[PDB]
Amino acid sequence: GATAVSEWTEYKTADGKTYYYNNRTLESTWEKPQELK
């Protein structure tokens, strides 16, 4: 398994944006990792 659409969680900010947070790595980001659609 690798980049098989997963290892990322979505979150909504007060601003009204949906960001993501890699759990396995614990890394947040605003840009989607072309594997969360």
Long-range pairs of 14-17 with CB within 8 A, sequence gap ≥ 24: none
C-alpha 37/C-alpha 18 separation (Å) is 12
Q: How many CB atoms lie within 10 A of CB 17?
A: 9
C-alpha 31/C-alpha 19 separation (Å) is 7
Measured at the alpha carbon of residue 21, what is the angle toward residues 11 and 18, in degrees to the nearest 5? 30
Write out the two tokens for 30.
């605003």
Q: Which of 18, 22, 27 is nearest to 8 (CA)?
A: 22
The residues near 2 (Cβ < 8 Å, ≥ 6 apart) are: none
